[PDB]
Amino acid sequence: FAKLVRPPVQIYGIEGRYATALYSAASKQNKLEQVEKELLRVAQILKEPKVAASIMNPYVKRSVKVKSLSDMTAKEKFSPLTSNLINLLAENGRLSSTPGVISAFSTMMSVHRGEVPCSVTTASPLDEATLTELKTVLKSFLSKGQILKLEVKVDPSIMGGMIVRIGEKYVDMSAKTKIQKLSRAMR
Amino acid sequence: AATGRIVAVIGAVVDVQFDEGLPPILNALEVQGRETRLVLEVAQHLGESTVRTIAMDGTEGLVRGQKVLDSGAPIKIPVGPETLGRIMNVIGEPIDERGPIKTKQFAAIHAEAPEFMEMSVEQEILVTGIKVVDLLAPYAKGGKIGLFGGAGVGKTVLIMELINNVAKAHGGYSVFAGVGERTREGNDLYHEMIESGVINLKDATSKVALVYGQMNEPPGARARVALTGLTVAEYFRDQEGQDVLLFIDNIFRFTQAGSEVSALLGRIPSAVGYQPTLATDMGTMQERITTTKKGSITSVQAIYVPADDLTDPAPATTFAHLDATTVLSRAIAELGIYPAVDPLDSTSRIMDPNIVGSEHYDVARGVQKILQDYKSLQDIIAILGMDELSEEDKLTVSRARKIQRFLSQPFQVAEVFTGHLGKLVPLKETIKGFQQILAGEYDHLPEQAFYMVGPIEEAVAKADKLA
Amino acid sequence: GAATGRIVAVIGAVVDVQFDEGLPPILNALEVQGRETRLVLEVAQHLGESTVRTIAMDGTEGLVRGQKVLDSGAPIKIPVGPETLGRIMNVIGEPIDERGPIKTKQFAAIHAEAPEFMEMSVEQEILVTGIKVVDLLAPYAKGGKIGLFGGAGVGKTVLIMELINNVAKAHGGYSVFAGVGERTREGNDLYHEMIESGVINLKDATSKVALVYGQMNEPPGARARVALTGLTVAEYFRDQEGQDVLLFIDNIFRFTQAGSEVSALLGRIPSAVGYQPTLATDMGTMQERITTTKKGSITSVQAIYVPADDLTDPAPATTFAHLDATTVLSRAIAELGIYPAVDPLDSTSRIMDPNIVGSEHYDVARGVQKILQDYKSLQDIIAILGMDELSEEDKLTVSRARKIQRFLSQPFQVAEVFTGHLGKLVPLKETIKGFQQILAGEYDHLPEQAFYMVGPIEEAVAKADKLAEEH
Amino acid sequence: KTGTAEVSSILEERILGADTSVDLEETGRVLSIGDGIARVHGLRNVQAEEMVEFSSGLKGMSLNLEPDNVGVVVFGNDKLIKEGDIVKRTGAIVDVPVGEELLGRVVDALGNAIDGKGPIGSKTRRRVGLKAPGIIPRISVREPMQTGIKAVDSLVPIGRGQRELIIGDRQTGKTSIAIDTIINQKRFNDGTDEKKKLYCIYVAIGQKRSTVAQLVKRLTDADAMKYTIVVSATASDAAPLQYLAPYSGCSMGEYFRDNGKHALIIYDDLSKQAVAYRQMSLLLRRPPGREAYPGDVFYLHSRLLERAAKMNDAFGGGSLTALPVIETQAGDVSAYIPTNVISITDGQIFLETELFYKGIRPAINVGLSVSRVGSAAQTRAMKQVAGTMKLELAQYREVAAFAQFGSDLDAATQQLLSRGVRLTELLKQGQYAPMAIEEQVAVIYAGVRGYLDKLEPSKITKFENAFLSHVISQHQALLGKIRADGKISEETDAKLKEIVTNFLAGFEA
Ligand SMILES: Nc1ncnc2c1ncn2[C@@H]1O[C@H](COP(=O)(O)OP(=O)(O)OP(=O)(O)O)[C@@H](O)[C@H]1O
Ligand SMILES: Nc1ncnc2c1ncn2[C@@H]1O[C@H](COP(=O)(O)OP(=O)(O)O)[C@@H](O)[C@H]1O
Ligand SMILES: [Mg+2]
């Protein structure tokens, strides 16, 4: 056997077996930034009431789901190493988990330049003068030549603060600090 | 019925992936590209056009990709009148090498039970002709028997005497079905049957149809030997209407081989280590032996009781089906009495006056009584003395000695050894003779003249000649 | 360093590592970085995608995933030689007695193969230890293999520390004590019982023993490899130097039993009563390296714990074939005060033979064992009929048999702190003569309390006079 | 469910292209090795039960054919196999050298040489996995096979073409019933007759090496290693080498069966093959059963112990006799493996350690032993005296409780305590002293006829040794008139009456 390029996520399960065999095969010949553009076009033709009618049908035939997608994957735009991959999943019986692999390849390819975004969870939204700081003072932490991304979700049970999660960091400043006043009642 | 490539071989378990003609369960496959026939019987379905099957010969030299056909039926066997006097294994091939079995129609080995409205509702008694078996533990018709006693007791001479009595008054042929038997003792059984007259290598005058599945044949082919010896036994019930017999040797190796198949597939075992389907698997075999309206099948099965444990899961389940027992013990052979039958420990479930009548019950309960107190005062006479028992105890010495010698009988299949002619007695000649010893009409007869005779008129005849 | 792997899964004492470049073979050693103590992991399986399944030799606390793992290129390499005498050593070959390091010029990797069929010395001898049950009924052999069975609390650390006194001081060759998982208390006596007795000398170079100690406060992967650090020091003295060695191991059941503690965590289906499915294979890989070849000799004495006094257990009953001589201590005998507890009707040797020990030694020890099996058929009669119903011949049997049973007992020298008696050491020529006379009838006129705890038969009449004077 | 060969390196090449660089029809790489079990990606054409041959020089055997890999057991150490090692094929089921160039040599379970003399010079081979004969090519056994033990030849006799199970506890005398079975054959194996010879094989499974080394020296000095093969899979090996070792020795003893010769094989012991199979199954993840044995473990000892046959005149007239050895654990003959092998074989010989210390050696229980063939597998003279002997040592067993506290009994019961304890003293026998057959018919004729009742029971085991040395030297012409005629005629039944009574006078001095 041979050694392979290490993906910077290393997920597990039935996704990350096939979603690393694709990352290692396409990182050879430097086919990396191209192949995500082709995997997002099979990511639209999978959801079709004739294509998805037999991509998850058990009772069609073991063989005719191999010729029907191989004729489909080659003619319209592309003939890269993905045409072998769709032929590889279909030859094994893993056609049901096909949307799982591309959602697994996307999170594996995103970290090659991405951030795994933070999650500010405070209140009803804010103005521009207090948000463009937190979209810039959250860039002062990382410092590795990167372009940050973010999510926002509103929760009122946190009464008077904001929680944020840069990766797996969780600097919590909120109204948990009422429960921390148990030490007054704790002798 | 189509062609299927192989895809896995693990032990005695083959895995066959068809394309269109997916066979049903219990369908016999046939591997192509080999020397002699290797069959496979389909036992599951797994999805993805894959079955799984239990092989019935050695699983060596099988390549991943061989093409295996489909017979479109279960294991079909030569079923006919020209199969008596022959030997075949589980899949019909002759192994005595006397020529191929030339037969017209075949039959599959897997069927269902007789129907609810095909049964018989009046219990009848199959006379054999043996003196102890007719009276003190009578056989039913359609019933099931247990035979206890191993080697060294006078056992195989009892089996061949059954077959040379069922064909002299009843006309129904038999089957032998050795399940997992010894290859060394399958030949002394064959070669004794030839010189005794039941199998004859010249003509159309045979009685037994040997079906030998032997001990070095894989566990998938050891369970199916009592079905192939049952399938032969139904042509002489269905297609001819006779009173079949059927010997299985023995009923424990049928059970033990089912637990090996069930553990090669993966099923979690039951109590002490047997298979979960232990009573249904015995059910679907033992329910095909009944008395339908055309004819019947009778059965006679030997039982091995492991570790002297009569409540072990395998002889518990087998005793739920029995209608009799027969016990061969070592001690009765020492007295000189043949066959070695213990008349106090051999039972019969139909021993009841509504089934056997009033005359037959009040004799086999009388002669069952006179031999119970003699076992009690086989100690008082063994310590205190002889003349010290009462004068009414000098009659329980006589009439428990004159009777247990009249439970002996000169067989016919051992004709040259004893030199005496083999005698048969009907069922009203068993009853006419035992009543007159408890009545003491023949109280003036010595205890040696009651030895190896036929009717009551012979013992008396024998006594006159002496001295 | 090569193949600097990384840790992925620490579940119990079974760590799995993942290698980028170079996969190491089975049975190697791996060095976990960044710890102030030395933790050694030995490779045991190859899983696929360049991950192996190891076993730690220490504590698995503080193991963070993603931690580097080096590789040495060989199995575990211990020190060996002549300078390992009068020392105590670890499983991976380190000092544990705080005397400094072991300065040797030769290392031996602990995984070797059993010597072949054409290197097997065939000769038998005899060996005299001084005990009237060993030397009479189950005699040893110079170069044989000797196993001490019996339950818990019957006398196995005493009978093995008495033979260290008897044989391993009057011996020209060397000895090794390997402690495979026992009480750390008992590993402090024998370090100090042999400093005052001259077998260990802490200033000069004339010691005659070497110690290997991994005890029962140790993780169960390191209690499976002090059985092999023992017979790697005890093989350099047999093969390389042409000497003669003695092998003392206590206890060897903790080698098997510490293999059942990591069987299912490795990924195997467990066998019968709970042992690993490789019982008689990992055992016989080790018990064939303890043999006498034609380059030297080894006389091995191993204590064998029988769990819950159950001799038909699979861990002792697969050890009865790797041994020449069995001395089986019972508990129903040591409850009668008889010490050594050795069962007369269950010990057995190979050289009990009328062509090696002589046809006078043989006729005696086959009449001691024949009168003790004649006793037990009378003990079922006494429980109903009582003692004063028996005939006058059968009364003579019970009296001699109780005289013989009491005469098999002997005060050891290491019971001078337990009982307060004084110790014996009986020669062989007196042992045969004493037992020959009790069977004849030449001491039928004495009380039984003379025979309890004496040496020679001439001391068992010097007690029956003191009992009659103080009457 | 993931599948074994679905690793991240197998899928990775199939995305690149077609697999032309490796062919996979003949060679397959290894996925994962552990504890003597390998997993191999490829090898599409491998037959079941086929030897493979690894990259580091070792061998293999194919047992699990699975839809994505093959699982192969490894012979030898496992520190030589790794992940990524090419495996190849040989193309056949395993075969072993076979001839008469094995006699006097010591071989392991693959037919190689270990005694250091030199390589085997045979020009034949044989597959280890062949079948038994059928119902037809056999005949009922009629040939005596003599051991030289007065108990085994007179109470539980063996014939040629029979299985007989040596069963008993540890330290009982098992290995020694079957080592003067070998030494006894030198009487016939140096003479001129051809249908009385025998060629013995000894199989040692899992013993330590220096018990075999003490057995090639026991047999050389007694001059019986010119017709004895020794097959030795010992304990330090791998587990499949101990699995093949009785098949490897039952094909070495079938060439002597197909050619009108005779043989005798001794498996020692069959309770260590069955543990060597069980280690191999439960690492191949085959489902367990009772006592964690696989389901097909009756199929191990049934296809092996049925190759011992007695062929007939149209096939050559050969034979093969097998004595398998089984060790119980504290008299428990109701465990799993000791109840398979009692059902297969044709009798057992049962040795106890209670009788071993009460002064009866060889420590045979007569009550719990049987041979199923029995009286047909005896000479016509040993049949004559043992029919009075087996009966009278059976009447002693019923009155054997009365003997402890008894003098107030009947004169008949005091007789069975008398005669039964003389016949027990005859059957004692020293180690490594087999006897000729017609000599045992002399000794047993003295006890069972009445010429020992007037003696003392410690003078029985002296009288036998003094009766034999008088009849060997001064009556050698009458110990060849039984060895030729076979049956004791009345002209010899009246002549031994004038020897024993004319020796019983001038003895007690
Ligand atoms: N007939 C006999 N007379 C005297 N001694 C005997 C006799 N048979 C065996 N022995 C003794 O028994 C001892 C052990 O016997 P052996 O080892 O042959 O039996 P075993 O049951 O095979 O033991 P294991 O099973 O441990 O190999 C030997 O030392 C031998 O001296
Ligand atoms: N001479 C002796 N014989 C028998 N037992 C003794 C003797 N002297 C002391 N004992 C006691 O017997 C016990 C035996 O335990 P020991 O042999 O130390 O451990 P083990 O549990 O390994 O047998 C000791 O605790 C000791 O108290
Ligand atoms: Mg201790």
Ligand SMILES: [Mg+2]
């Ligand atoms: Mg042995």
